[PDB]
Amino acid sequence: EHNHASAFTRTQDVPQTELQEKVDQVLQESNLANPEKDSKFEELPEEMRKRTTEMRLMRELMFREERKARRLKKIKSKTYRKILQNVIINEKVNKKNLKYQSSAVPFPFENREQYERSLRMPIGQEWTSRASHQELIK
């Protein structure tokens, strides 16, 4: 999988419009990779209680990776701080529907209990839910 064609970045990494090459030659006259703007905001009890205005100022001021590093620094600092009979059935053989039942037990099973435990549940739409039907027929 290649990196997706996003609308948050440049899909060629060389300036593709006149605007882009103008902005990049100005920005390489004065670069803005923001290592300076990382080291500028990577600096900033009574620091907790009294500094309730410069804290909000630095919160508004800091950039994306600066705020990520500030969250990581606060997380690491707090984690370092804390830790006669009535029924007569006939038993004749049903010679017309002994063709609807198999002759012996088929190969992968060892007995008809196993084999009929395979056959015991219908996979139909009418007898399972839709999700179970799909799991049974894929």
């Binding site: 609807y100 198999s102 088929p106 139909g124 009418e126 007898w127 839910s129 027929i137």
Partner: protein, 461 residues
């Protein structure tokens, strides 16, 4: 007294606006749905009958065939629809199987082109242009291996000197060829098996066990440095290309016509030999086959694996081809035609859905691997119906009434009569060996999977 009846209300069951479908309330009570075994038995029976009427497997022959019967075929393992075929009169052809028409033909040699395969030739001075040129090389009995390039219209990136970029040369004839799947290498069997690369005009190494010739060759597809070959002393030899040497051989009863390696299991291969069956062998233990695929009635000429590794196709000297599930050992399907004679080459296309057979009247024919299966794209209702019917035929597979229908084919008269006299012969020898076993003392029970190996170098402990 409190009282409540059924209030059906007609807003939930027949819709207000006419453009939309009606509600289908369900209720999964088995009281509501009574005949749950009989109903899906009849659906499985109607699925087997629908398969037996939808089985129309012949797609079409491609082109006009050759002039003198197709004895070599090679697919290329990276493009879906391209196919190289060579005949007895030395002509080779490259095929677009979409339009069923040749990109190019080539009077390649003078004798039989006895082998051909395809390459991505790793030259270290030039760069291979594989988006507009395809490469096939081919060996014949006039002591030549020739490498050809083909102009291919598959990408439209560019806009050119097509044929015969080089000519390797041996002192004796060649009989088989297969290309390594990397590193510019191929191997040719013949009077002796040589290894070659596409830069040097001479063999890098001769890797022959003894002074007995080699009839066929296949490289492995994964673990690509393991070769296998069939020699006319009924021998199957494995070679390794790390050690640059043969590895182990076995001698069988009759002669192995072909090998194909399993593309999904990397140590299993299938041999196709002259007693009329195929043998599924493990490379790590050649003392026993791990399957025998038995249903042919004359000498099996060629075998191939599905790219899913789950089934094999197997064309034989009785003028018919047969498709086998890999775990069973009998034929799942037989394809025949009154026009098809003596199928000498079979490949299984990289789609795993079509089967290419080269016969010896000249023609190369496409078939469906699943005959009842059509190749359109399917809406979810028909796709769900088709896989529901497959699962239902699967779980009712052994009922006698649907087994006698799914088992049924029309086989030619010659194959049917050979089949029934083969049956009465095998039943007679089982009767006589049962009598002989009743009398005599120590008759060992030899397995069917061992009944066809006369011996093995590098014995197993």
């Amino acid at each position: 007294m409190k009282i409540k009846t059924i209030k059906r209300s007609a807003d939930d069951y027949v819709p207000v606006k006419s453009t939309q479908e009606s509600q289908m309330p369900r209720n999964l009570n088995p009281e509501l749905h009574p005949f749950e075994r009989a109903r899906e038995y009849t659906k499985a029976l109607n699925a087997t009958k629908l398969e037996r009427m939808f089985a129309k497997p012949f797609v079409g022959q491609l082109g006009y065939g050759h002039r003198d019967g197709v004895y070599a075929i090679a697919k290329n393992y990276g493009s879906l629809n391209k196919l190289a075929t060579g005949s007895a009169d030395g002509v080779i052809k490259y095929w677009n199987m979409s339009t069923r028409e040749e990109f190019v033909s080539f009077k390649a040699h003078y004798g039989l082109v006895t082998g051909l395969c395809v390459t991505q030739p790793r030259f270290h001075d030039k760069k291979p242009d594989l988006k507009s040129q395809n490469f096939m090389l081919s060996c014949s009995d006039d002591k030549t291996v020739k490498l050809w390039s083909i102009n291919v219209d598959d990408y439209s990136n560019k806009n050119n000197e097509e044929g015969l970029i080089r000519t390797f040369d041996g002192e004796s004839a060649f009989q088989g060829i297969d290309s390594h799947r990397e590193n510019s290498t191929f191997a040719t069997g013949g009077a002796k098996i040589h290894l070659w690369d596409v830069n040097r005009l001479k063999p890098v190494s001769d890797l022959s066990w003894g002074a007995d010739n080699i009839t066929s060759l296949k490289f492995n597809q994964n673990e690509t440095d393991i070769l296998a070959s069939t020699g006319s002393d009924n021998s199957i030899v494995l070679y390794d290309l790390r050690t640059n040497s043969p590895t182990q051989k076995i001698v069988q009863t009759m002669r192995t016509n072909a090998i194909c390696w399993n593309p999904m299991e990397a140590f299993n291969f299938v041999t196709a030999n002259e007693d009329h069956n195929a043998y599924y062998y493990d490379m790590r233990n050649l003392s026993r086959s791990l399957n025998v695929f038995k249903d042919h009635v004359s000498a099996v000429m060629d075998v191939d694996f599905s790219p899913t590794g789950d089934e094999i196709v197997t064309g034989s000297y009785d003028k018919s081809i047969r498709i086998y599930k890999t775990n069973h050992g009998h034929s799942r399907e037989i394809y025949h035609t009154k026009r098809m004679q003596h199928v000498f080459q079979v490949k299984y296309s990289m789609d795993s859905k079509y089967i290419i057979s080269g016969s010896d009247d000249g023609n190369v024919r496409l078939w469906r691997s699943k005959a009842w299966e059509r190749s359109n794209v399917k809406t979810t209702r028909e796709k769900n119906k088709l896989e529901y019917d497959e699962k239902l035929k699967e779980r009712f597979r052994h009922m006698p009434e649907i087994k006698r229908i799914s088992r049924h084919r029309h086989v030619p008269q010659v194959i049917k009569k050979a089949q029934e006299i083969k049956n009465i012969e095998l039943s007679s020898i089982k009767r006589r060996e049962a009598n002989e076993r009743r009398t005599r003392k120590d008759m060992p029970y030899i397995s069917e999977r061992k009944k066809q190996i006369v011996g093995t170098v590098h014995k197993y402990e």
